[PDB]
Design an enzyme around this catalytic site. Structure first.
Site, short mmCIF file in Angstrom:
data_model
loop_
_atom_site.label_atom_id
_atom_site.label_comp_id
_atom_site.label_asym_id
_atom_site.label_seq_id
_atom_site.Cartn_x
_atom_site.Cartn_y
_atom_site.Cartn_z
CE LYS A 1 -19.17 49.16 21.60
NZ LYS A 1 -18.64 50.53 21.87
CB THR A 2 -18.30 46.29 27.71
OG1 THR A 2 -17.80 46.09 26.38
CG2 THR A 2 -17.91 45.08 28.57
CG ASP B 1 -14.16 54.77 26.61
OD1 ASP B 1 -13.51 53.74 26.33
OD2 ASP B 1 -13.93 55.47 27.62
CG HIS C 1 -12.10 48.19 19.23
ND1 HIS C 1 -12.50 49.34 19.87
CD2 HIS C 1 -12.00 47.24 20.18
CE1 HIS C 1 -12.63 49.09 21.17
NE2 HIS C 1 -12.34 47.82 21.38
N1 LIG Z 1 -20.27 57.73 34.40
C1 LIG Z 1 -20.54 56.63 33.68
N2 LIG Z 1 -19.53 55.90 33.18
C2 LIG Z 1 -19.98 54.82 32.47
C3 LIG Z 1 -21.29 54.44 32.23
N3 LIG Z 1 -21.33 53.29 31.45
C4 LIG Z 1 -20.08 52.99 31.25
N4 LIG Z 1 -19.20 53.87 31.85
C5 LIG Z 1 -17.74 53.80 31.85
O1 LIG Z 1 -17.14 54.28 30.67
C6 LIG Z 1 -16.04 53.41 30.29
C7 LIG Z 1 -16.30 52.67 29.00
O2 LIG Z 1 -17.30 51.65 29.20
P1 LIG Z 1 -17.43 50.38 28.24
O3 LIG Z 1 -18.71 49.69 28.58
O4 LIG Z 1 -16.18 49.60 28.26
O5 LIG Z 1 -17.58 51.10 26.79
P2 LIG Z 1 -17.60 50.42 25.35
O6 LIG Z 1 -16.31 50.69 24.67
O7 LIG Z 1 -18.75 50.98 24.59
O8 LIG Z 1 -17.81 48.97 25.54
C8 LIG Z 1 -15.74 52.58 31.53
O9 LIG Z 1 -14.79 53.19 32.38
C9 LIG Z 1 -17.10 52.46 32.22
O10 LIG Z 1 -17.01 52.35 33.63
C10 LIG Z 1 -22.35 55.23 32.77
O11 LIG Z 1 -23.57 55.03 32.69
N5 LIG Z 1 -21.87 56.33 33.49
MG LIG Z 2 -16.81 47.23 24.98
#
Ligand SMILES: Nc1nc2c(ncn2[C@@H]2O[C@H](COP(=O)(O)OP(=O)(O)O)[C@@H](O)[C@H]2O)c(=O)[nH]1
Ligand SMILES: [Mg+2]
Ligand SMILES: C/C=C\C=C\[C@@H]1O[C@](O)([C@H](CC)C(=O)NC/C=C/C=C(\C)[C@@H](OC)[C@@H](C)[C@@H]2O[C@H](/C=C/C=C/C=C(\C)C(=O)c3c(O)ccn(C)c3=O)[C@H](O)[C@@H]2O)[C@H](O)[C@H](O)C1(C)C
Length: 391
Positions: free
Chosen positions: A22-23, A19, A71
């Protein structure tokens, strides 16, 4: 669609706690660069968070980027993904700071040899307090130092992957200097261009590409993907499929693609799709290697110099013993192997370096000097190097 090699190619990817972004950052990277180079195909956040392997280029280089789900159940995939990275982008949320996976991914990156780390402090849109931001950076730098990465030297870019992505969605043509958030992505792209050096590719050695995955291109045949380790490959080339199966198979390359685009010839460093003639997805699989005929052979028994990790390095406090059957990680796969210590030696303790024999339960393309890791379940317990092939 054809792919023309014009800039040096580099492989990177995103790691970091769940979260943290990354994505979202992966999607932002493709949109931001797409504004400059049309050859860059847009990749929505929804699709990546399903392909997770995208491409994008800067004025200096062409990049292949793997977005690690990160994960625990994807551990084996992170291992092969990180092993093929020339550098990794560590995403850390400014609102949370380093978390367990930040530490876990860093150790794995070290153990598989990721050469460089660039940090992207994400979600700064959620944190304004200058002190909290500096504290997070301090913590990340210290964490990196803890696993022996040059924490005090790595680039630490502060930004918001989400705001940058939303801006590109609003204006796909947004260019550098027009939006503060998008510009933070360019700061990261610049840091990647500068801090992560372009490694020397072994293009003059015999062709060898460990198979990452195998698919059937509907109405075209089976395709084997992976990152070329050395040498080159082109349509019409004869190649051997070595390891895992009962016997070595020989076929001819019918296609070579870069991100689904026809490629003249693949070279070491390129992560491509190699379409093979007359072979079903039942004849080629992850773990096997494609190589110039006669350049490498399949084996099960060998001798190796092995370092047993200390408990202080995440290993076990008990040593290795004869009859031990841990998993041996060679390139893109892992196979069970039976350990046999020399006469008189009942155990090899953590922290010691010794040479013993191993007999894998399945054949693997092996050669002297080939490095491999030893893991018992999800724990790294040893690091070895093949020193002699017995059979
Ligand atoms: N406020 C905010 N939310 C973000 C940001 N980058 C990602 N998110 C959010 O946080 C959540 C997780 O993002 P994701 O890229 O899937 O995280 P991952 O598990 O590292 O791949 C999602 O709901 C995204 O919209 C950012 O710069 N600011
Ligand atoms: Mg991801
Ligand atoms: C790592 C998995 C597969 C690797 C496979 C193969 O590895 C290789 O063979 C590789 C070659 C060396 C290999 O064998 N790696 C195999 C191994 C290699 C190991 C080295 C190098 C090392 O030196 C002893 C260095 C990291 C060394 O350790 C230190 C680490 C200390 C960690 C303490 C963690 C502790 C108490 C802990 O509780 C802890 C934690 O905090 C986080 C997560 N968890 C889960 C933990 O439990 C420090 O970071 C130093 O830098 C090649 O890379 C191959 O091409 C590859 C990739 C096919």
């Amino acid at each position: 669609g054809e792919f023309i090699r014009t800039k040096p190619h580099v492989n990177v990817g995103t790691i970091g706690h769940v979260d943290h972004g990354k994505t979202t950052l992966t999607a932002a990277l493709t949109f931001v660069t797409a504004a400059e180079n049309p050859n860059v195909e847009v990749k929505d956040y929804g699709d990546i968070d399903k392909t997770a392997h995208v491409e994008y280029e800067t004025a200096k280089r062409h990049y292949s980027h793997v977005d690690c789900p990160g994960h625990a159940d994807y551990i084996k995939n992170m291992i092969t993904g990180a092993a093929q990275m020339d550098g990794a982008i560590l995403v850390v949320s400014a609102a949370d700071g380093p978390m367990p996976q930040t530490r876990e991914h860093i150790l794995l990156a070290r153990q598989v040899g990721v050469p460089y780390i660039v940090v992207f402090m994400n979600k700064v849109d959620m944190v304004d307090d200058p002190e909290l931001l500096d504290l997070v950076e301090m913590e990340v730098r210290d964490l990196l130092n803890q696993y022996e990465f040059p924490g005090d030297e790595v680039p630490v870019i502060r930004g918001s992957a989400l705001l940058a992505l939303e801006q590109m969605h609003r204006n796909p043509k947004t260019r550098r200097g027009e939006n503060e958030w998008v510009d933070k992505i360019w700061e990261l792209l610049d840091a990647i261009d500068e801090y992560i050096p372009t490694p020397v590719r072994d293009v003059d050695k015999p062709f060898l590409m460990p198979v990452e995955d195998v698919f059937t291109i509907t109405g075209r045949g089976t395709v084997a993907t992976g990152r070329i380790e050395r040498g080159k490959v082109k349509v019409g080339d004869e190649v051997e499929i070595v390891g895992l199966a009962p016997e070595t198979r020989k076929t001819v390359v019918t296609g070579v693609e870069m991100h689904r685009k026809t490629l003249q010839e693949g070279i070491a460093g390129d992560n491509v799709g190699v379409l093979l003639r007359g072979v079903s997805r039942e004849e080629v699989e992850r773990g096997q290697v494609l190589a110039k005929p006669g350049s490498i052979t399949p084996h099960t028994k060998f001798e190796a110099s092995v370092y047993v990790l200390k408990k202080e390095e995440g290993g076990r406090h008990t040593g290795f013993f004869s009859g031990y059957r841990p998993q041996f990680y060679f390139r893109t796969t892992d196979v069970t192997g039976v350990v046999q210590l020399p006469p008189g030696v009942e155990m090899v303790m953590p922290g010691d370096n010794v040479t013993f024999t191993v007999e894998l339960i399945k054949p693997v393309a092996l050669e002297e000097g080939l490095r491999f890791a030893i893991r018992e379940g999800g724990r790294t317990v040893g690091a070895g190097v093949v020193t002699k092939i017995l059979e």
